[PDB]
Design an enzyme around this catalytic site. Sequence first.
Site, PDB file in Angstrom:
ATOM      1  N   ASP A 106       0.912   9.363  -1.426  1.00  0.00           N
ATOM      2  CA  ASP A 106       0.567  10.409  -2.391  1.00  0.00           C
ATOM      3  C   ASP A 106       1.479  11.636  -2.425  1.00  0.00           C
ATOM      4  OD1 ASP A 106      -0.286  11.299   0.159  1.00  0.00           O
ATOM      5  OD2 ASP A 106      -1.865  12.509  -0.694  1.00  0.00           O
ATOM      6  N   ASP A 132       1.475   5.592   3.747  1.00  0.00           N
ATOM      7  CA  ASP A 132       1.504   6.985   4.145  1.00  0.00           C
ATOM      8  C   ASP A 132       0.163   7.161   4.862  1.00  0.00           C
ATOM      9  OD1 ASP A 132       0.550  10.027   2.699  1.00  0.00           O
ATOM     10  OD2 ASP A 132       2.302   9.881   4.012  1.00  0.00           O
ATOM     11  N   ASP A 137       6.933  10.825  -0.201  1.00  0.00           N
ATOM     12  CA  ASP A 137       6.699   9.381  -0.270  1.00  0.00           C
ATOM     13  C   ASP A 137       7.474   8.768  -1.440  1.00  0.00           C
ATOM     14  OD1 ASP A 137       4.644   9.056   1.818  1.00  0.00           O
ATOM     15  OD2 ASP A 137       3.276  10.059   0.445  1.00  0.00           O
TER      16      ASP A 137
END
Length: 994
Positions: free
Chosen positions: A703, A351, A707
Amino acid sequence: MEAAHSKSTEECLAYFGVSETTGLTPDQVKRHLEKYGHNELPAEEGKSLWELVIEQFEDLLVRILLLAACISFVLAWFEEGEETITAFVEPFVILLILIANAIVGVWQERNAENAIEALKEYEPEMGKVYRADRKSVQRIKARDIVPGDIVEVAVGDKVPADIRILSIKSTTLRVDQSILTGESVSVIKHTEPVPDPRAVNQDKKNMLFSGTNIAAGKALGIVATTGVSTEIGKIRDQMAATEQDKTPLQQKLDEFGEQLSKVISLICVAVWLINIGHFNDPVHGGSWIRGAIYYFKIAVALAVAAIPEGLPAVITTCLALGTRRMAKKNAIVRSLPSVETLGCTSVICSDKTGTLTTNQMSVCKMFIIDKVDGDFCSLNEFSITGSTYAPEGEVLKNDKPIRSGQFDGLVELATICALCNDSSLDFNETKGVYEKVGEATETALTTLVEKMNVFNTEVRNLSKVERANACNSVIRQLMKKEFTLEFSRDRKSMSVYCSPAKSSRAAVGNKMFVKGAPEGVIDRCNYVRVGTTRVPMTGPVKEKILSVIKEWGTGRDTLRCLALATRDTPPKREEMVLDDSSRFMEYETDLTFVGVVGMLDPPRKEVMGSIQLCRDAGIRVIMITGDNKGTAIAICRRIGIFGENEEVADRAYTGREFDDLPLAEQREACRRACCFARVEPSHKSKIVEYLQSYDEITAMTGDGVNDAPALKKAEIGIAMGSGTAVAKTASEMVLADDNFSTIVAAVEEGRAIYNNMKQFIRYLISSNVGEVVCIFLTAALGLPEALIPVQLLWVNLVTDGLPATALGFNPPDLDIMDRPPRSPKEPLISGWLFFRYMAIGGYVGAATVGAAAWWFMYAEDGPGVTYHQLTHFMQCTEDHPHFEGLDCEIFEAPEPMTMALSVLVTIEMCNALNSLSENQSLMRMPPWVNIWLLGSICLSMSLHFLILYVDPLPMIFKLKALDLTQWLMVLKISLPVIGLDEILKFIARNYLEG
Ligand SMILES: C/C=C(/C)C(=O)O[C@H]1C(C)=C2[C@H]([C@@H]1OC(=O)CCCCCCC)[C@@](C)(OC(C)=O)C[C@H](OC(=O)CCC)[C@@]1(O)[C@H]2OC(=O)[C@@]1(C)O
Ligand SMILES: Nc1ncnc2c1ncn2[C@@H]1O[C@H](COP(=O)(O)O)[C@H]2OC3(O[C@H]21)C([N+](=O)[O-])=CC([N+](=O)[O-])C=C3[N+](=O)[O-]
Ligand code: ALF
Ligand SMILES: [Mg+2]
Ligand code: NA
């Protein structure tokens, strides 16, 4: 209603036949509620403890060790007063660890937090609807909302369901959709249709998604979908029915245990083709229910020689130690197996925001006018350090620190940023860090003002709580904010009306401070400020200004840019119509340009390095973000995923683009591209899946709630310590440190760990090889039971169960991280090693069968009964003539076994000193390196003695301590094994590849 975003407000109203003015009727609700269900997310509880137990017995090697344990309880009845002292000692220990260890496994499955539960925390309890019921807005339980409902939302509300926006009551509706994008910035909604029926969430600016929250404004909408038919519902589905795959090492074992199911079931039928002799000639000594006891015993003897028990505990131990080891490295491993799996990771999907970046919008560049003269215009450019919201950093002019207050333009620039702002900064005493309060974009401005300190306010002695807004408060004391002309979509700017502090409402000197998209603001400027002066905005000055904005807006930096201006002569407060936003642009006219600021969410400091290391270890790193492609690519260049000038046309895509590619091309894309942007939750899991279809062990790191699907799907989901509960609950590990570098070291640990498991897994299965050779010989050769199925167990749990958990301490390589990912299919035993462990297998096998026959024939106390009759021990009464010299009932005595097990033990203690290295001469590599291995043998041996001296023990094992004579021979039948493999390691080190 599907694709409500593609239709008009009327079309959506019509679709449910509902009145925007009255809402659903009690009847409509009753019906819809029946057809669509409750606006809720199905809860998914973890399997009951009962399930957790039944599952522990699904392993073949366990169902075989259980099926045999039963046959050991069936033929356990046959036991008279000759050996009734130990009739049921085996059927006890065989099912003892069979559930003793099998139960410890449940202490690794019933230990898990539910992710869907964490996800349901985004379901608001209440919602607000207009039902034909009453005239006033009703506040009801969210789960009671249904499609077609007319819902109302306002600042602070957490959206109850996926809603099509009908009417926006405020000048703008600002939304935080980070549960779907991972980006906290406010999204501006509108009510017009969004034609493209494949638009991604980021594109549906006319919808409100369940779980997100309203940052600003008030709006009315119609519910499109509820329950699992929402965007948060899709996230929900990808976390429900999923179930993580089986570790690579686990498959290796499942293969082994599956072949061990064919070999053993073949060895028994192999003895059948050897027992075709006592069935021909006429001879009987008991019914078949008393004669077939032979076969159902050679099976319960192999089941303990084959199945390498103890491993299930040596492994769990190695992992537990690794976990604690990594824990000190700031890596909380929630899944013991994943530790090994992280070692063989080839691709790391990551991410961006909050993972690769700090997620703290920061003003890093800014400029004002230096001097103007005809076609010449120079700008004073500056840069600002600091990547957090903390008022810690400096302003640089050509990389040299300066005092912002020296430049009058920066004094005004700071004033604008301090006043034309609805946010502020706060110091979280509990967490010990500074945090925003309001829009990230505005808090960057708040922080900038503190770093600048244009009036040289004294702040070094202020508490961090008071340091947070010190310089801003100073400026707020110079001008009073009368009112603010909020942002408007047709203006792309915002302003605040201010009057000098301590002046009359009629006094002169009022100002309007403007902030907005550069084009619009700059076009509404007729003057340019120079220090404290002002000159006409001319073509050349405008071009100079725009040229730098263009640079800063699209390059290796690609920054979000804001122009700052002030109207030196604003209209009279009275002549201004505040309730009509369409008139704000005209008030924000005849402006004086002041300066520009450029901001971005900066990469974390230790990331560019972590990625280079990953590269060295042969691990690729891909970025998958919900943020835009332009800033996505710029961050990739900053951290080293893309070359500073590398062409990325075909190496970066948006979710929409990606969706256009046909299936085969989407796949190839994941192998070629390294940057995916403006994606949706499902795009991340899909990219990970494609990566897994190329047989790659892929990790996912992030986070956000968006995700979660990818984190679940990846073989190794890694969540940020300061990330969402959802992300954490869907991971295998958590970087409590938030350091990307912690991932690199976790990989190293995973590589080092596996290499050591690679050894004891061999040392153990190797031992189980010699054992099967023994039972096989003393079954088709005729000899008696040299080793009972009750001894092997103790051998493969304590005898070897120690040296194994000792090899797991072998000092790892020094170039462990300079080699590429090991293949997921790389077999443990094959080639010269398959052959090597093949010879060492038979050796120990014939080294125990012969060591038993020896004690009898060529030995001492044992009668010299030659082989021609030694195998006729089953004929000490049916044939006395051709067999009668000494006592008969002496076979099942602690002599043939106590001399056959002493070999297995001595040999294995030798095998350990050998497993200290695959192809390495013990003479070369000091067999005394792993000090623990040495101490491990000193314990297994003293335990081989302790199982002899203290009678209460050898009473069941049926063993009698040999004196200082017999044992002398044992050390001569095993010691030579050190030389056997020693040559094997020479043939592999020379006449072979390495
Ligand atoms: C537990 C004890 C034993 C003896 C067993 O049956 O192991 C076999 C077996 C199932 C395999 C074999 C054993 O096979 C033989 O040694 C051939 C038959 C000899 C019969 C002699 C007459 C009594 C392993 C042990 O050994 C050697 C020395 O060749 C190596 C390896 O195993 C591994 O790599 C370990 C995986 C944890 C496996 O070929 C493996 O099958 C697979 O699928 C593998 C890929 O796994
Ligand atoms: N339909 C649209 N098309 C393009 N840009 C838009 C649109 N709608 C809103 N925006 C602007 O794009 C931003 C979201 O996407 P990124 O930053 O990731 O590209 C939004 O940020 C601000 O205006 C918004 C803004 N605000 O919404 O209140 C206030 C501002 N301000 O005065 O402080 C400035 C904005 N700005 O962009 O500079
Ligand atoms: F923080 Al992201 F996609 F970059 F959710
Ligand atoms: Mg994130
Ligand atoms: Na995972």
